[PDB]
Amino acid sequence: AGFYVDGNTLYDANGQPFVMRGINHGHAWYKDTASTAIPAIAEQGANTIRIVLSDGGQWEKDDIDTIREVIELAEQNKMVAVVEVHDATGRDSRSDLNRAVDYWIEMKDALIGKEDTVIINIANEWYGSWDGSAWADGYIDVIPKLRDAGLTHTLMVDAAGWGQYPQSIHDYGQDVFNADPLKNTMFSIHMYEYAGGDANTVRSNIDRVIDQDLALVIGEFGHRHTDGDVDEDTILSYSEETGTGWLAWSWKGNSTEWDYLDLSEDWAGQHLTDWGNRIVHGADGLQETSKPSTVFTDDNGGHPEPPT
Ligand code: NA
C-alpha cells in the first residue's frame, strides 16, 4: 500500500482511481503557515495539496521535522500530499537535479511508510530547455537511486521547458517510465501561457500524454489575466472529461505582480479571491468534482463485519 499507476490512471492503495483536484501551497516561502493553510485548503474541498519544499538551494531548507509536520497535517485533513523540491526550477544542471534527489534520500525516514498518502514530485520544473532527450537522461539516471534508497511511492515527473514543454513527455515519457524498476511514475504539465493558452492547446497537451497510456496531472496552472491568456475553463472541463488531475497555483503568497494567482486573501481561507471562487465553487471546480482518496476512510470498502 499505496499509490500505483496502471496506464493513464493513478490508483489509491484500495485500487480506486484517484483524480487529483487540489491546490499548490508555497510552504517553502511561508513555513510557519502550515497548520493554518493546510486545513484551510482542505476546507475548500481539495483532495490533494502540492507542498512546495526547498532543499536549501534558493530558499531556506525544509528540514526533516518540517516535512513530518506538513505530512501529518495533510493526513489529518484527509488530503494526499504531493511533496516537491522547488530549487532546481528551470535548471538544465544535473547537479541541481542531484541535490533534489539527495534531499529525498536524506529525508527518506519522513516518507517511508506514507506511500498510501504521499506522492513524490522529484523536482519542480527541472530542465528549463526546450528538448526531451537530456531531460529524460536525468530521470533515467536518478529514479533507480530513489528506489534503491527504499522509496516506493508513486513518483511524479514534471515536463521539460519549465513544465511547459509537454512534448518532452510525449516523446520520452515511456523511456522515463521504463527506467523506474517499480513502474510507478506519473507526469505533470504546468499550464500557463505556453502550455495552456487556448482550448486546442490544453486538449492536445493532455492527449499527447494520456493517449500514450501515461498518467498525468496538470500540477500547476493559472488563469486568463490582462497580460495573458490561460484557458482555465478548458483545463477544468477537459480534465473532468478525461480523468486528468489538476492542482491550481496557488493558495496564497505570490509576489506582487503575480498576486492575481492567489486563491485566498487570507491564510485561513475565510476570504477567497475571484480566482479562489472560480477554482472552489465554479464549473468543474473542487466542490463539483473533488473526491477524497478512499484511504482516508477506514471502512474496508463496505465489507460486512461478522455478527457478535
Ligand atoms: Na462471535
Centre a 10 Å sphere on the Cβ of residue 68 and count the other Cβ atoms it contains: 15
Instruction: Please report where in the chains the cell 511561508 appears, as a residue.
Output: 30
Of 8, 7, 3, nearest to 243 by C-alpha is: 8
Would residue 220 show up in a list of annotated catalytic residues for this protein? yes
Helical segments of the chain, H only: 34-43, 64-76, 94-106, 108-111, 133-148, 167-178, 199-210, 232-242, 274-281, 286-289
Per the DSSP assignment, residues forming a β-bridge with 81 are 49, 118
> Distance (Å, rounded) from C-alpha 86 to C-alpha 58?
8
Would you call 174 helix, strand, or coil by DSSP? helix
- Respond yes or no on whether the N-terminal peptide bond of residue 93 is cis (omega within 30° of 0): no
CA 13 to ligand 1 centroid distance, Å:
29
CA 307 to ligand 1 centroid distance, Å:
6
Of 76, 104, 49, 78, nearest to 245 by C-alpha is: 49
Q: What is the largest CA-CA distance in the chain?
A: 66
Would residue 60 show up in a list of annotated catalytic residues for this protein? no
Technique that determined the structure: X-ray
Q: What is the resolution of this structure in A?
A: 1.8
CA 304 to ligand 1 centroid distance, Å:
14
> Distance (Å, rounded) from C-alpha 231 to C-alpha 221?
9
User: Residue type at 29?
Assistant: W
Annotated catalytic residue: which of 220, 232, 257, 305? Answer: 220
In the chain the domains, ranked by start, together with CATH numbers, are 1-308 (3.20.20.80)
Would you call 109 helix, strand, or coil by DSSP? helix
- C-alpha angle 207/155/140, rounded to 5°? 85
> Distance (Å, rounded) from C-alpha 270 to C-alpha 292?
22
For residue 46 the three cell numbers come to 481539495
157 within 8 A of 185, measured Cβ to Cβ = yes
Strands 4-6 and 9-11: antiparallel
Cα 78 from chain centre: 16
Sign of CA pseudo-dihedral 32, 266, 123, 144: positive
Annotated catalytic residue: which of 69, 84, 115, 125? Answer: 125
Residue 55 backbone dihedrals phi, psi, to 5 degrees: -90, 15
CA 305 to ligand 1 centroid distance, Å:
11
CA 306 to ligand 1 centroid distance, Å:
7
CA 302 to ligand 1 centroid distance, Å:
19
238 within 8 A of 244, measured Cβ to Cβ = yes
Sign of CA pseudo-dihedral 298, 304, 306, 308: positive
